[PDB]
Write a protein that binds this ligand. Structure first.
Ligand SMILES: Nc1ncnc2c1ncn2[C@@H]1O[C@H](COP(=O)(O)OP(=O)(O)O)[C@@H](O)[C@H]1O
Ligand SMILES: [Mg+2]
Lengths: 52, 171, 118, 337
């Protein structure tokens, strides 16, 4: 039973490699989204003000 | 392009029934989910971020202010540059993760090799009815140490000895 | 959008309890509370409590109620009914919700009935 | 009264923005609202609501205010029917919601009762049936020889105390190709669309339905029969055995799922996974109240690295065996979490 349990560490590291990489990668790639948020807000304000 | 990343992430999640009890891995999962949801919501709701001066200005006749706001927008087109600040601390997290992964897999590989050796030995080297007591004593001096210690202590009892071994006692 | 999704949920759950109560009135009269399961019995008791709590004294009706009128703020009443819906005041008798204002008045009336009256 | 009639009319109205913002005119569905007997404040609410959700551009508001003369209320649905017939005869598809139309009925009753015309039943004139039928029959699906246009009618009836068995209600039901019943009973019982599955019947079940939603797995077709069974053996009926318990749980979870927030038109590419989840993985839901958030989480799950399935069921229309297997796998993966 211990053998069967340890059989599952055989390839966990290979997948969790890309998992841990892309986790932080995607979490920090929202910087461009944050920079786009202010531009989108400015555009929304401009459209609203000219609608006014 | 994103399909492979979260596909392998949830593959690891499907493997993660055994590392249950984690604190922030699932929390980081909902964090990624919330951030990407805000991504797609802002990208879908984002109308073309420019005033249609050809038509959406021509409808207004006495504006006197469309030129001002358009000039302001044009001057503020470079709103801000991307923040690629993280170049070493994230690398530190990755080198820690690499160290943990390599030491882990070394441990796993050596443990499986040891346990196939164990089963292979146990298959045809199991003297159930022909094991020598002298061989047992020589293999493990710990049982010898225990025996002399309890002999010199005077407590001849061996706690937990009638639990599995019968007595056939005529008494 | 106008309410705030909290007072709206409280009102929705109040309507839930009252509609279930009215639907079960027929078998309550015919059979009784025993026939209902534990969830239905709890729902009926809670709905009775809310319906009693709906009574509010009015300053222009003191000669009729005999109790000074109460002016309950919106936040006060929504918080009180949210607390009632969670079952925090299930042990309190339903009569304590009769001619009261906020949940503090409910607690006061329950204490008076439990100590001075009983 | 105020059981969600104009509300479901509004969700039908707003859902068309998905296709009206495109280019395929064969899928564009122009909208015509008939505000006969409604008050001007309600019509302003309506027009602003359509303005917010980018819907006023393709919708048409024909308002017959109660303060306006009764002949105007009588005629406004007919004029809106002509407006929709313009789209219908030019190869376009028009949805006209004859909201109220009981106010038009009473306005025409006023017209007859001051025009010296003797009335019929409950002082209603003779041709309220003929009026309703003649007005509604203008809504039809034209053949390809006539441009393949269509004109869809969504009339309303404001019943008095749930009295479906009344002259005007049963009269209009005999005209329309099916009815959508809403009562306060289900409205306060929790059903937010207030869809009374019993007396709500559509005259074209298999047709006029998305192929991905009609039968695909079979259960989606006898969905209505299953709901009728659940009503017939609801909590009042004795819980016979484990099969009966499973049927009751299935019905309760299904009616839990059907609740939908106002001004939230949920597309068929997102409807189909939810209806399928109501047949497999529905029974093990963690409390009935949590299905509300479970639906949102399942939508989010289908959005992430499953948009291929969503666009496949949106574009193709039919569901293949491999598509059904993929949907089952996704449902199992989600219910596992
Ligand atoms: N999803 C929903 N479906 C139906 N009604 C809703 C929903 N959400 C909120 N409501 C409430 O139900 C009422 C629907 O009544 P309405 O359709 O206006 O009938 P009428 O126009 O005949 O008064 C609205 O006042 C609204 O506040
Ligand atoms: Mg209405």
């Amino acid at each position: 039973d211990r053998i069967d349990s340890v059989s599952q560490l055989q390839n966990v590291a290979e997948t969790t490699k890309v998992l841990f990489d892309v986790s932080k990668e995607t979490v920090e790639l929202e910087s461009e989204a944050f920079e786009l948020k202010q531009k989108v807000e400015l555009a929304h304000e401009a459209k609203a003000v000219l609608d006014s | 392009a994103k399909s492979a990343a979260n596909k392998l992430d949830w593959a690891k999640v499907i493997s993660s029934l055994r590392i249950t009890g984690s604190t922030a891995t699932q929390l980081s999962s909902f964090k990624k989910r919330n951030d990407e949801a805000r991504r797609q919501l802002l990208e879908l709701q984002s109308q073309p971020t420019e005033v249609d001066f050809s038509h959406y200005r021509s409808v207004l006749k006495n504006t006197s202010v469309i030129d001002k706001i358009e000039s302001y927008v044009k001057q503020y087109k470079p709103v801000k540059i991307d923040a690629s600040k993280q170049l070493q601390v994230i690398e530190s997290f990755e080198k820690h993760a690499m160290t943990n992964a390599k030491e882990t897999e070394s441990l796993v590989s050596k443990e499986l090799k040891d346990l196939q050796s164990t089963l292979d030995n146990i298959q045809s080297a199991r003297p159930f009815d022909e094991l020598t007591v002298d061989d047992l004593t020589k293999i493990k001096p710990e049982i010898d140490a225990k025996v002399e210690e309890m002999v010199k202590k005077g407590k001849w009892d061996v706690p937990g000895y009638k639990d599995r071994f019968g007595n056939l006692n005529v008494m | 959008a106008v309410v705030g999704q909290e007072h709206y949920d409280v009102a929705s759950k109040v309507q839930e309890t009252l509609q279930t109560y009215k639907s079960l009135q027929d078998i309550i009269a015919i059979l009784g509370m025993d026939e209902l399961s534990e969830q239905d019995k709890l729902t009926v008791e809670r709905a009775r409590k809310i319906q009693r709590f709906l009574s509010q004294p009015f300053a222009v009706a003191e000669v009729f109620t005999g109790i000074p009128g109460k002016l309950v703020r919106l936040k006060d009443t929504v918080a009180s009914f949210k607390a009632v819906l969670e079952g925090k005041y299930d042990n309190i008798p339903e009569h304590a919700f009769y001619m009261v204002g906020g949940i503090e008045d409910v607690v006061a009336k329950a204490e008076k009935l439990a100590a001075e009256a009983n | 009264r105020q059981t969600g009639k104009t509300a479901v009319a509004l969700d039908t109205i707003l859902n068309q923005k998905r296709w009206n913002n495109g280019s395929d005119e064969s899928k564009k569905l122009y909208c015509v609202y008939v505000a006969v007997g409604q008050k001007r404040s309600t019509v302003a609410q309506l027009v602003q609501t359509l303005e917010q959700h980018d819907a006023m551009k393709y919708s048409i508001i024909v308002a017959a205010t109660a303060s306006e003369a009764a002949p105007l209320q009588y005629l406004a649905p007919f004029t809106a029917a002509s407006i929709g017939e313009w789209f219908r005869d030019n190869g376009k598809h028009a949805l006209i919601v004859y909201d109220d139309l009981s106010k038009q009925a009473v306005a025409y009753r006023q017209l007859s009762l001051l025009l010296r015309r003797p009335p019929g039943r409950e002082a209603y004139p003779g041709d309220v049936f003929y009026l309703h039928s003649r007005l509604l029959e203008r809504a039809a699906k034209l053949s390809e020889k006539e441009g393949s246009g269509s004109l869809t009618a969504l009339p309303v009836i404001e019943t008095q105390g749930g009295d479906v068995s009344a002259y005007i209600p049963t009269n209009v039901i005999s005209i329309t190709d099916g009815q959508i019943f809403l009562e306060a009973e289900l409205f306060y019982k929790g059903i937010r669309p207030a869809i009374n599955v019993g007396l709500s019947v559509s005259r074209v079940g298999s047709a006029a339905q998305v192929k991905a939603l009609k039968q695909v797995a079979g259960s989606l077709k006898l969905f209505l029969a299953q709901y009728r069974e659940v009503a017939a053996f609801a909590q009042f009926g004795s819980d016979l055995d484990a099969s009966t318990k499973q049927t009751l749980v299935r019905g309760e979870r299904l009616t839990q799922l059907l609740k939908q927030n106002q001004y939230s038109p949920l597309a068929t590419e997102e409807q189909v996974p939810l209806i399928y989840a109501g047949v497999n993985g529905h029974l093990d839901g963690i409390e009935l109240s949590r299905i509300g958030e479970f639906e949102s989480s399942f939508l989010s799950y289908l959005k992430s690295n499953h948009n291929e399935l969503l666009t496949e069921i949106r574009e193709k229309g039919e569901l293949s065996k491999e598509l059904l297997a993929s949907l089952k796998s996704a449902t199992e993966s989600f219910v596992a979490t």
